[PDB]
Every structure is written in structure tokens, then in C-alpha cells.
């Protein structure tokens, strides 16, 4: 109730209003920022020390590929928000600073999540662990895994072995958790800190009357964890030389804190996805003032913008043999959502959304951050075109419908998690729940809960399916039975797993930076979509006949007659890749969840289209056994023969409405197909989008889309002389990766995925 | 569902039964003991080994008792179960076995309950912290007194400050948990850990389903870590070259065994009270069979049970100097229920009653462990007149009212923890809570919630009675008003604590040993009730004028005239005190409480009646600002004036039905008053103690009986020559200590109290 000198001088020229008196981010914002329209002219090229930085920070990254494992990592500390050293690429170069460790890309153990994967990337990188780190986190502080594996049951260890339900939050950080690290910027830590006291203080009542106790008593040591990490903070930021008491009192400080606020985050946390947010319009506020005061030149500013994204380029965690699996590519998820419209109809694209772009061409392209554009059929034809250069230059970006999602959540200050998972800043978050395997899920259907691999029974004792020929109302009906099945030791699985990570891997630094109560959604997510509406669609429209072993179990089929496959925009296949969306999402909205999060949807695999084909034996729509189910939504490779237009059709009639955390859909399109010359490409990609993306009352829209645009011939070149692609990214199922990153494996599936030849 | 070799020949001979089948304790007891109603001359002397080991230990109490500080302590270990190797006094003499550390006495850092209070011991004591420790338990592994103080209140730190709540369990472990240590016996470890397995799986289904989910997983985790705590207990006893994974043999065994089980509690947590259970009978089941087949000789089952009391009167714990104001005397209470009557009808006492009893005489004197006599008017008169003849000698044990406690659980396997309170065993716990003061309570309401000492405003802002003259029923009238204000903050401060305690410091491996569902009651102790209802009388019977300073505040009072006062057989104030009794109870009844523990009140203070007295200002009743209350329901020091009737019958009147944690009254009555020589002085004890205990529809009897028989001039004599009475015990409060064990102001304490001189 009285701003001190701090913010006076901070805030000089800023418009007013509530975010001066409470923290309030979006009204900040709001009466803040300057739309731009304009085009990329202005933008300035990289400084030599952005090019000396990054060339040197290059040869760790080639050494990570060729080795396929850690430059190097901690074997005796236990990772904290204040236990390493300040570190430094070349600390006379940089003006963004900060790396988790002491040096570039040494990654640290981060115990409170599990011992045993921590024991386990020892071995598989040949590095000892002090026995100390061992014994402190076996016998003393418990952690995460343990607690998981000391709840789980019988079954959901069967689901995990079995391949139907694997790969969930049990061994790794759940991540999908964006703190708003602006706020660090905008106030400072100081006022962050009082305004945790009040939310502390303002639990007292309950407390002393009964009310919710459990829950009152939780969430008062949660909001004390949160204040002692914002401490912390301080303390971590001092290290570097920097005093964040305050608040940024200009473009280098707001960049410089609103990143410590991130990196307290990633010293602390291993979560799978660790987003960044919805910065770069927040950022250019600061920008803009420090360029009309004649403080600091556009070239300057670039600068800072590179040299932050350059940090976000050299996030690591040391991740196991298994987790490299399901997630492949060394992937991060520093999420940066751009552009966008606003509730009010002015475009919140600024210079600075170029600004990020740019870093793509300063420094080449990269997979992280993963840059994230916020498309509007309204956005400014300048950006809308500029975003689609870049994608054919870099193949560098993902789109995701603002036009749907501003007015979902009626908030233009929604970020996106990992991949395609929204959340309004600093005040929802999504508890992580990986992916089910729909198909085997199919295969258990019809063989009575048996594993068509192991021979074993994992799903509940049923009839197997008998018949020369198989029959869609019958199998539907089982399936249904076993989706029932699927969905109650899906949700307890997660039940479990996030008592147990707010218990033993409370994420304190990013929750301090949340309002005093988050919505949670548990998010769910199906893989092998295309393959489970693909095997309905030849069981109904051509005749599938199992081919049984001396046991009555279906380990193969034949097919006879063509079916519609899904992704050529043929309503017969595609309604039925509809209503598998639809039907497990109601199955799954009736369980009770931890914490009441609210349960959603997300057709999303990441790599666990590998991991899931790898476990599953042959399916009624062709797919050989061990082969790869398609990327998130993705049509099965090479099924959507169309053109363009039919596959973007299919996918946007996936319902977001039953899918609330997303839908995935990586989309490469071969240069001359997409036009003839660089203008037209820009201008048929920015109407393919405009399309794809088009919302009215009666059409939702796509979700999201990754945009590719190369030449499989190229890729195939870049297998057999890696050394000649060390930056060559591309997007491979909501997030990128460095091509050289992946297993030879990971690649024979991305080469093998669909090259769209036309319209 | 099928006996193995192992049980086979441990229950050879053995009447068979439900115990078998299921963990059942009491059915094995009920359906193998023997009844003993035979006297005293049985019992066989110590032996050379027996002498030797004790007078070796004894040189170290005598150390403690000398310096008032550790014989040792560890500086640099965490204790667990396994952490420490084997220890010995002579391991050539010893019978029974097990130390908890690697050397008679010396006490280990148990830091999961905090790490603030081991730096304080430490400070105290001389001796430096390793700093690995420290780090380890700030920022690893945090603990059960930082979680406390992460959530306290401002209110409860002024009340803990202030002296009118202090001494909760937020910085030393809760204690008042009984495990059935009989069940290691009994059992073996292996049918142990399989029945807790079966426990945990009974679970699955509701955590499946949803029902109770979070209950669900934190219980399936709490019986997690009390199937590992078992297995741990396995490791601990192999390093004394012991194999307890089946049932115990032998009497030797058994005995080992059920001690095994106490010593991974005493080694894993330090709750203030250890309490050993009701195991003197049980025992006698397996002592009984070695006897009859001539495995054994009486003095050989002496030796045995010496050796096992002896290990008893070696429990330590690290405690810190506020701790020892709070319990004073390095009280454990190991208490042991000797005795009481079958629901059948039948004794309970068998020859092992016996035997506990003579290790006062095979090895003298001891305030350890607690050994309290289940009294029943029907007991056997042999057994009436040797523990009247042992309280004569020793003033060693305290006596409990089996006819009312019985009854009331409709159980005759219940046990007493700590000092009074009881608890049906492996079924029942309490949730410590320590105790609240009643006395300043009263001055708050005269005082308008301004604390006396400190001049601040504690309570709720409330009008300061005004006049020159007290009138009863307006002080009353306020003060039923804080006590509702008191109550509410006490059950806040005892939930937040046992929610803490419960996640940072919970006691698997007493847990291990109770059945899947405990209850459990929230005991709320009250300190100053003589005082309090003392006061009252004053003002009531007398004419009690505040003496108020330059600000109102009433600190001092004059009274004019005569009134009754508490311990005289004087319905005019004993009503007030049972009052006060009922007023409180029904005011925590009505309040939520973590984990809905049942409230229960208990009117105990340990030492509390000296750190409330020394805390609280001049009361009512005329006793002088910075006096000591009574301990526990006691008469104020000297006030009871007409004789042992006239006390026992005030005491008997509160109402056990208000106070189902128990009612703590010390008696002490000088040789010549309780009869002219030795038989008559058994006779008269006897006598005493049957009518204070007797019970029928319309008499409640009293509850509890500490009994000293000793002259003053005794003690005297032992203030001023410590080296002439070693081991010198005495009845303080609801446990005994050696009389050197004590500070001066604790003697000062002691030597002031009534020595009653008539009946
Ligand atoms: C440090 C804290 C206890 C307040 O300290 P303070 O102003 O010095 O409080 P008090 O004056 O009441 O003293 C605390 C007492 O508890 C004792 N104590 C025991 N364990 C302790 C612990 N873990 N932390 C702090 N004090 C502790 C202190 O030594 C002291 O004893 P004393 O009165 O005999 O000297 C602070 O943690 C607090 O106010 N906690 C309440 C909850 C809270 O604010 N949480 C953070 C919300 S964002
Ligand atoms: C050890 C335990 C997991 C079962 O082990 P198991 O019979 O070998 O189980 P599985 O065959 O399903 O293998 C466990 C898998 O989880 C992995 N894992 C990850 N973290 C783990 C952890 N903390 N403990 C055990 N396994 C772990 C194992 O490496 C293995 O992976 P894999 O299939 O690729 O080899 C046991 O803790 C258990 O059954 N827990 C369930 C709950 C329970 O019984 N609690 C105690 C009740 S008293
Ligand atoms: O630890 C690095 C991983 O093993 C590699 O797959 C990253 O591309
Ligand atoms: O060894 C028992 C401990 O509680 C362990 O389970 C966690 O540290
Ligand atoms: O640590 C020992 C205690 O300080 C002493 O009071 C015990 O009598
Ligand atoms: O170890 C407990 C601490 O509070 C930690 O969570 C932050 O330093
Ligand atoms: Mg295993
Ligand atoms: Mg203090
Ligand atoms: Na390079
Ligand atoms: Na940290
Ligand atoms: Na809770
Ligand atoms: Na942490
Ligand atoms: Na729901
Ligand atoms: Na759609
Ligand atoms: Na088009
Ligand atoms: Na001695
Ligand atoms: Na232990
Ligand atoms: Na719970
Ligand atoms: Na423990
Ligand atoms: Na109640
Ligand atoms: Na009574
Ligand atoms: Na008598």
C-alpha cells in the first residue's frame, strides 16, 4: 500500500493500474505493450559476441549428438537453487547470465526425485556416484520414485511392464509447470516475498476454525517452501553479481531477472517439460522504453534477446537410457508462447515477437527454446508472413490456435506447456500424466485381457473374441469395456504419482510464482490414435480375419478389401478417431482425482509412438508389430495420401472440446509442393495455416501444428554425414529436435513418417 | 493359512486358538498364562553376572546425575534402526542384549524430529555438530520441528512465549505410541511382514475406487515403511548374532525378542515417552514352560527378566536444557503394566509379576522402568501386600485403577503409556499434546488477555475486570470465555504438529507392531488445576482485592478471610476443580482435529507445574508469582491438611469420565503415619489404596496413585550428601527419578510438596 523507492524509479513512465498494487501481470501488460504491425526490416543481425558465445557452446552440443550422452555431470552434489558456483560461457561476452551448474551443459542429479535413475545414468555413462549421495537419498530424505513404487499395485505394475501403460511420472520430474518468471522482472523479490506472507496469513481463519484442515495445513507449508525459495532466489542471483531485491528497472535487468526466476526453476526441478511461458511480448515493455529513451540501440537489443535465448539453448538434465526412449532428442520444452490477439482485438505481436524469431537466424536454427506462435486468422500479414518464412527456412516452429484458445479460457495471457498443453500464467498448471497405449488397449479387447506379447494376463480375465472374421459392434463393445478399465488404473496410477510429487518434489521456486490457488487439470493422454481408428475402420469396412496360435490368442490378421484410412478426409474413418477421443474422455471425467484436478485429454506421445509400437504385436489395421504408432495425432505413417488439405482436415476435426490439453500434429511439406518460389511459399503457408486454424461458432478449428518444410532427400543425407547438419532441427511431435540428437532408430521413424507431395 | 516348521516347534505345547490364525495377542495370553496367587518366596536373588553388569552401569548414572549432562553422545550419525553396530556392557554376562548405540549410555542424534534442538544439546553440552549433519537435515531432509514452525501462527508463538502454551511437541519426538513388541515374540518377523503385506493389499480396492484418497495412499505408504521398518528390525538383531525372522523358542528368547522389537523403537524415534506395554504376564507364558520342563531354574528366569529391566533402566535420549525444565529427572518412562484382572474374572498377576517387581531389590532402586500395578480390589491379597511391601521399600512403583479402566475398554490387554494414559495394545495411540496452563487462563480473563509478566496482549482484546472486590461470578464468566479462546488455539497447535509429525517423523516401527486401523485420541493436557480452582474458591468464600498497576493490570491479589481449598475433602472447592474438569472437556470436544483423533484430556504436568509456575504471575489463591503448581491434579504444596483419606477422596472425585487420558496424583506419606511397624504398614497401604480404587455403579474411584513412603528428613539429608543415595528413587508426577537426578530448583520443588503426616 505504498510503493518504495524501488518501484519508482522501475516503473517511471508506465501506465497505472491495478498491477502496481497487487501482482497482476496481464493488466501490467495490458495497458503497457506496443502492438506492432510492421514488418522484419527493422531487425538487426548477431553481435561477435553473440557469434563467439554460441560457436563455442556449438562444439558441446556436437560432442552431446555424436556421443549421445552428457558433456558431463555432477556425481557428488546434490542440485539446490543455491548450491552451485556461478558459472560462465565467457564472462566478458555475455549480458544475460546464468547456467544451472558451474560450467556450460554439465548437467546436475536433481535426488529428490529418485535415487535408483540417478544410479542408473552412473552406470550407463560410466560415471561413479559417491556412495554419500546414495545413502543421503535412500535412508534419509526419501524420494518421489520411492513413494510411488511403495503405493503402486500388482497391476499398474503389469500396465507398465506390458507396454499399455508406461513411461508415466513415476521415474522423472512432471514438469508442466510454468511459474510466471515476469513476475520476478515486474516486482522484484522483495514485494514477491510480502505478497507470499499475506497468502500465508490469510489461511489463519481456516485453520483455526476447522475448515478443509488437512488441506489448509498443506498448502500453508507449501506457501512457506515458496517464500524460502524466493529467498533463495536472491541468493542465487547474487552469485552472479546481481541484486533482485527489486524490481528490473530496465530491458537488460527485466530480461536478466525474468530469467533467474527461470533458472532458480531448472537448478531445482528436473520436470520433463520446464516452458518458459509468455515473455516476449512482456519483454519488449522494457525494450521499447530503453529504445525511445536512446538507452540502448536495436542491435543492443537483439543482443540481450540472444543472449537469453542462447541460455534457454543450453538447458540440460541428466536423464536415463529408458527416459531417452520416450523422450528422445536431449528435449527441454523451454516453451515460449508468441504473438497472439488480445480480448480486446489488438494484436499482442511486438518487435519483440521478431526479436525471438530472429534468434533463428543470429544463431541459427535450434530446437530450443521451442517457439511457440500464437496464430490468429487476424494477426498482421507482415508477422503471419514473416512466422511462415522462418518455418521454411528453419522448420524451427509450432502454431497453435489462439483464435480457439484466447476464447476458451476468455484470457489472452495463457501460455503453453510442453507441447500443446494451455494454461493461463501463474495461475493454472496441468499435473503430467504422459500417454495410455489405445491400441494394445484394443488388441486386449479382443484377446480377453491377455498380452498378445507376454501372454500374460494384465487386463481383467474376458472372453476373447471368437470368429473367422472379426465384427465392429462386437469389438467396439469390448473395447469400450476395456477403455472403462484403461481409465480407472490410468487415474490411479496418477493419483498416486502426484500425491507423491507435491509430497517429495514439491516444485516450491515455480510455485512461488503462482497466485496462492492454481487450477490443476490432470492431464491424460492417448497414444496410438490413428492405429486404434484405423483398425476399426478395416474391421467395419473390409473383412479382418485373426490369425490365432495354439492358444486362441490373435497375434496377426489379414485383411481382405481397402478401408478408409484416417487423414484423407474421409468421414467414415475420421468419426471414428472422433468418438475414441470423445469416449475415453467421459470415462475418465467420472474418477475421483488427487486434489480434485479436473481431469483432460491430450492426444500426445512425444516418443512413446516408438516406445508403445516397440510393445505392441500386429494390429487389425495392418501395422506390423514393433512398428512405431504415428506422432500424437498424426494419420499412421504414409496413410494420408491426399494432399494437404485432407490431412489438416481430419486432424482439425479431433475435438478440443474432449481434448483440452492438446492435439498434436507434425505436418512436413516438401518445398515445391508447398510453391514454386520463396514469396508464394510464404504466402500458400500462411493460407494453409489461416485454414487450418480458421474458428467460427460451428468450427473449432485445428489445435496445434508443427510445421516441416524439407525434402526427405536431404534428411537422408544429413544420416550419412551428420557432421555436415550440426544445427539442422527439425519438428517431430510438438517440440523439435537437433536431427544428429536422435538414435539411428528415432530416425528410420522420422524418415519413414509422411513428406506431403501436394495440396 | 498354514503353520511352518518355525511356529511348530516355538508353539509346541501351547493351547491352541484364534492367535494362531491372525496376529492375536490377547487370545494367546487369555488361552496360555497362569494365574498366581501364591506370595513372594518363590523369588530368587540376583546372580554374580547380574551384580557385576549393574554396578559397572550404575558408575555412569552416577556420572549423569554428577555433571546433569550425557555420559556421551554421537555428533556425527544419524540413527536408524541399522545405522549402529553392536554395543555391550560385558558381552561375556549378558543375557539379554541390545544397546542403542555402540556403548552403554551414550545417547545418538535422531534428527529426523529436528535439527535446531541437536545444535542446542550440542551448544550445551560442548561438543561440535558435524557439519554434514546440519546440512543434511536443512536442506535435504527437512524436518519435523522446521514443517511445525514453517506453519505455527503468530498466536500460538505469543502463547508459546508467553507461558500460557508451552512445551507442545514441536521440538522433541510425540512419544505416547505403544508397537506390541510382544508380537516379535509371538510371531517371528517373516508372519509379521506377511500380515502387513495383507494389510496393505486390503487397500487396494478403495484406492482403486476412489474412496478416501488420500487417506488411502497415505496409510498404503505408512504401512510401506512399517513392513520395511520390520525388515530393518531383522538386520538390527542379526548384529547381535541373533535370527528373529520366526517366533521366539524359549524364555530367553521371548524375552529377546519383545525387547528387539522396543530397542528398533528407542533406536529410531525419541519420543519423550517409550513406553515398554504389558508384557510381565506374557512373558510369564513362556518362562512358565521353560520352568515345568526343567529348561530353566527360577534364578536363571530372574536373571533373565533382570537383565531385560536392566537394558530398561539404560534407555537415553539427546535432550536439550529447555527439555530437562520441561521433563525433568532424563525421565524415558518405559513403562511396563504389571497385573490387573481378566475380563473373566480371573487374576492376570502370574510369578513374572513377581519377578518385575524384585528387580528393585536384585538391583535396587530404579525410576526405570515405570512399573505401574493394574489395582483391582480383587487382585490376590499376596499380591496387595508385596507391592504395598515394594512401595514401602522403594517407592519405586505407582498404581493404576484396573477396576475402572477395564471396564471402561471392556478390554484386559490395555496399557499405560507414559505416566496415566491408556491405550488398548497394537489398537490405540495417542497424539500427544502435552499440556495447556489453566492457572494464567484465569488471570487473562481477569486481566483482559493481557499477559501479567509480559504486559502484552496474548489473548483476545477483552475488557480487564474492574472493582476492589472479585466477585465470582463475573471471573467466572470471563474465564469460561478464554478457556473457549484457549481451547481453539491448543487444538490448532496440536494439529498442526501431529500433521507434521506424522510426515516427517513417522514412527514405523512402532506402527509395525499395531493393527492396520489404530485409533487414535488427541490428548490435551491441563496444568494448574488446584490452583485455578483454588482461585476460584478465594474469590467465591472469601474477599479476594486486585492489587493493580499504572495500567490496570491486575499482579498481585490480598485476600480477606478463610476458604476452602483443594485436597480436604471440601465439596465447596473439589466442585469447582471437577468443574473446571468438565468445562474444558466439553469446550475441545467440539473442535476438528487432524486425522479425527478423538479429544481426551488428561490432568498431568510433568514438570510443566514448575515452567508454568515460574512463567505465570500471583494468583487468587495467594500462591507467590514464580511458584511451582502442583504436579499433575496435587493439592497446591501443603495446602492438603487433614490427612491421606481427606486427599485421596478429593482426588478420586475428578471425573476419569472427563479425563479418559488419565488424572496424576503423588502421595506421600512419611513411615510412622502409615502404620507402626512393617506389616501393618503393608496392610495399611493396602488398605489405602482399595478404598481410593474402589468401584461400583455410583463411585468412579480415583484413577492414578504415585506412592512415596519417606521422611522428609531423608531427603534432606540427600540434597546436601548426593554420594549417600545413588540410587535414591521417588515418585515426581507420574514417573519416578532418581532423587540426584534432579536440578536444585527441582529438589526445591520436591522437598516443598505435602509429606502427608495422617491418615
Ligand atoms: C523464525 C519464526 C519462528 C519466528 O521467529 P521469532 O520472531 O524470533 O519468534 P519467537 O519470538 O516467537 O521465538 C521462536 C521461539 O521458538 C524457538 N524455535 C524452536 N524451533 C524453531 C524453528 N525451527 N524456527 C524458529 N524458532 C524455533 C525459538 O528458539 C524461540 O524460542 P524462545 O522463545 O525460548 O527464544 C518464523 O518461522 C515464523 O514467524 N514462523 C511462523 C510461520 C511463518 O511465518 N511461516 C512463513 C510464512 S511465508
Ligand atoms: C520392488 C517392487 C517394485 C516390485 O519389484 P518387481 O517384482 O521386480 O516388479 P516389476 O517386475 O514390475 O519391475 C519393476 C520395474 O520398475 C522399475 N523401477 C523404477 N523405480 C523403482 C523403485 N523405486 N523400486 C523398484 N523398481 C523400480 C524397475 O527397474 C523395473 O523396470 P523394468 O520392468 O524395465 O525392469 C516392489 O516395491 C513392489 O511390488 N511394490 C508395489 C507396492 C508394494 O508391494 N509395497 C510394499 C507393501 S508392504
Ligand atoms: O544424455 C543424453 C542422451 O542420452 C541423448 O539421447 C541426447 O540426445
Ligand atoms: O529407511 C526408512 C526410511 O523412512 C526410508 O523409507 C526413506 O528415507
Ligand atoms: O542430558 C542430561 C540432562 O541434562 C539431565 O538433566 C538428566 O538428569
Ligand atoms: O529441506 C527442507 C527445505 O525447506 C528445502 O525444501 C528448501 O531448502
Ligand atoms: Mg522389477
Ligand atoms: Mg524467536
Ligand atoms: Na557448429
Ligand atoms: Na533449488
Ligand atoms: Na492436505
Ligand atoms: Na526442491
Ligand atoms: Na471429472
Ligand atoms: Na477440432
Ligand atoms: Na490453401
Ligand atoms: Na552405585
Ligand atoms: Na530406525
Ligand atoms: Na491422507
Ligand atoms: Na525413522
Ligand atoms: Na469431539
Ligand atoms: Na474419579
Ligand atoms: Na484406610
Redo the contacts between chains.
Keep these: 500500500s505504498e510503493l518504495n523507492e524501488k518501484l519508482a524509479t522501475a516503473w517511471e513512465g508506465f501506465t497505472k493500474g491495478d498491477w502496481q498494487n497487487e501482482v497482476n501481470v496481464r493488466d501490467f501488460i495490458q495497458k503497457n505493450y506496443t502492438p506492432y504491425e510492421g514488418d522484419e526490416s527493422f531487425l538487426a543481425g548477431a553481435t561477435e559476441a553473440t557469434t563467439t558465445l554460441w560457436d563455442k557452446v556449438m562444439e558441446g552440443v556436437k560432442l552431446e549428438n555424436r556421443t549421445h550422452a552428457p558433456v558431463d555431470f555432477d556425481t557428488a552434489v546434490?542440485s539446490?537453487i543455491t548450491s552451485h558456483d556461478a558459472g560462465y560461457i565467457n564472462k566478458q561476452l555475455e549480458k544475460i547470465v546464468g547456467l544451472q551448474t558451474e560450467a556450460p551443459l554439465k548437467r546436475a542429479l536433481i535426488?529428490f526425485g529418485g535415487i535408483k535413475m540417478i544410479e542408473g545414468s552412473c552406470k550407463a555413462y560410466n560415471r561413479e556416484l559417491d556412495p554419500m549421495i546414495k545413502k543421503?537419498?535412500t535412508?534419509?530424505?526419501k524420494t518421489h520414485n520411492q513413494?510411488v513404487f511403495?503405493?503402486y499395485?500388482p497391476?499398474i505394475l503389469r500396465c507398465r511392464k506390458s507396454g499399455v501403460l508406461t513411461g508415466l511420472p513415476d521415474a522423472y520430474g512432471r514438469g508442466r509447470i510454468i511459474g510466471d518468471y515476469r513476475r520476478v522482472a515486474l516486482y522484484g523479490i522483495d514485494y514477491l516475498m510480502k505478497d507470499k506472507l499475506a497468502q500465508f496469513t490469510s489461511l489463519?481463519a481456516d485453520?483455526?476454525n476447522?475448515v478443509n484442515?488437512?488441506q489448509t495445513?498443506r498448502l500453508?507449508?507449501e506457501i512457506?517452501?515458496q517464500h524460502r525459495a524466493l529467498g533463495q532466489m536472491k541468493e542465487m542471483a547474487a552469485k552472479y553479481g546481481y541484486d533482485i531485491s527489486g524490481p528490473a528497472t530496465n530491458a537488460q535487468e527485466a530480461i536478466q531477472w525474468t530469467y533467474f526466476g527461470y533458472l532458480a526453476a531448472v537448478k531445482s526441478q528436473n520436470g520433463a517439460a520446464m516452458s518458459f511461458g509468455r515473455t516476449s511480448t512482456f519483454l519488449d515493455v522494457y525494450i521499447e522504453r530503453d529504445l525511445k529513451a536512446g538507452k540502448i540501440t536495436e542491435q543492443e537489443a537483439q543482443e540481450m534477446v540472444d543472449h537469453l535465448v542462447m541460455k534457454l539453448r543450453m538447458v540440460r538434465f541428466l536423464r536415463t537410457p529408458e527416459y531417452d526412449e520416450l523422450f528422445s532428442g536431449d528435449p527441454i520444452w523451454a516453451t515460449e508462447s508468441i504473438g497472439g490477439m488480445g480480448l480486446d482485438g489488438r494484436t499482442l505481436v511486438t518487435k519483440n515477437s521478431f526479436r525471438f524469431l530472429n534468434t533463428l537466424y543470429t544463431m541459427g536454427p535450434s530446437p530450443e527454446p521451442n517457439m511457440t506462435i500464437l496464430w490468429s486468422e487476424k494477426l498482421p500479414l507482415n508477422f503471419k508472413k514473416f512466422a511462415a518464412k522462418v518455418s521454411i527456412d528453419t522448420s524451427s516452429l509450432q502454431y497453435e490456435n489462439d483464435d480457439l484458445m484466447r476464447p476458451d479460457f476468455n484470457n489472452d495471457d495463457y501460455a503453453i506447456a510442453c507441447c500443446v498443453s494451455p494454461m493461463i500464467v501463474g495461475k493454472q498448471m496441468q499435473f503430467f500424466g504422459a500417454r495410455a497405449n489405445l491400441a494394445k488397449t484394443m488388441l486386449y479387447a479382443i484377446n480377453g485381457g491377455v498380452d498378445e506379447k507376454l501372454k500374460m494376463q494384465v487386463g481383467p480375465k474376458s472372453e476373447p473374441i471368437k470368429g473367422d472374421v472379426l465384427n465392429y459392434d462386437e469389438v467396439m463393445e469390448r473395447m469400450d469395456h476395456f477403455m472403462d478399465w484403461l481409465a480407472?488404473?490410468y487415474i490411479?496410477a496418477l493419483?498416486?504419482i502426484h500425491?507423491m510429487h507435491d509430497?517429495y518434489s514439491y516444485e516450491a521456486s515455480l510455485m512461488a510464482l503462482h497466485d496462492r490457488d492454481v487450477i490443476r487439470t490432470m492431464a491424460c493422454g492417448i497414444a496410438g490414435l490413428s492405429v486404434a481408428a484405423d483398425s476399426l475402420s478395416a474391421i467395419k469396412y473390409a473383412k479382418v480375419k485373426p490369425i490365432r496360435d495354439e492358444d486362441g490368442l490373435a497375434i496377426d490378421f489379414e485383411i481382405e478389401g481397402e478401408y478408409p484410412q484416417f487423414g484423407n478426409n474421409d468421414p467414415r474413418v475420421d468419426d471414428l478417431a472422433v468418438d475414441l477421443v470423445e469416449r475415453f474422455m467421459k470415462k475418465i471425467q467420472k474418477?475421483?482425482?488427487?486434489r480434485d484436478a479436473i481431469p483432460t485429454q491430450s492426444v500426445l506421445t512425444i516418443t512413446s509412438n516408438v516406445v508403445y509400437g516397440k510393445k505392441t504385436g500386429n494390429t487389425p489395421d495392418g501395422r506390423r508389430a514393433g512398428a512405431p504408432f504415428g506422432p500424437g495425432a498424426n494419420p499412421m505413417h504414409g496413410r494420408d495420401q491426399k494432399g494437404a488439405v485432407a490431412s489438416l482436415t481430419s486432424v482439425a476435426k479431433l475435438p478440443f472440446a474432449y481434448a483440452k490439453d492438446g492435439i498434436s500434429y507434425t505436418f512436413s511439406i516438401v518445398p515445391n509442393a508447398l510453391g514454386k518460389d520463396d514469396e508464394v511459399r510464404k504466402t500458400n503457408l500462411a493460407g494453409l495455416m489461416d485454414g487450418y486454424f480458421h474458428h467460427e461458432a460451428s468450427i473449432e478449428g485445428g489445435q496445434h501444428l508443427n510445421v516441416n518444410v524439407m525434402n526427405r532427400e536431404m534428411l537422408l543425407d544429413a544420416m550419412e554425414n551428420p557432421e555436415k547438419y550440426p544445427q539442422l532441427t527439425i519438428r517431430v511431435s510438438g517440440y523439435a529436435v537437433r536431427f544428429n540428437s536422435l538414435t539411428k532408430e528415432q530416425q528410420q521413424d522420422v524418415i519413414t513418417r509422411t513428406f506431403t507431395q501436394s495440396m
Tied chains: 1, 2.
Excluded: C, M, S, W
Design positions: 546434490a539446490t535426488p543421503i537419498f535412508e534419509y530424505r513413494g511403495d503405493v499395485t497391476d489463519q485453520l483455526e476447522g484442515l488437512e495445513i500453508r507449508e512457506a517452501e480407472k488404473q490411479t493419483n498416486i500425491y509430497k474418477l475421483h482425482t488427487y
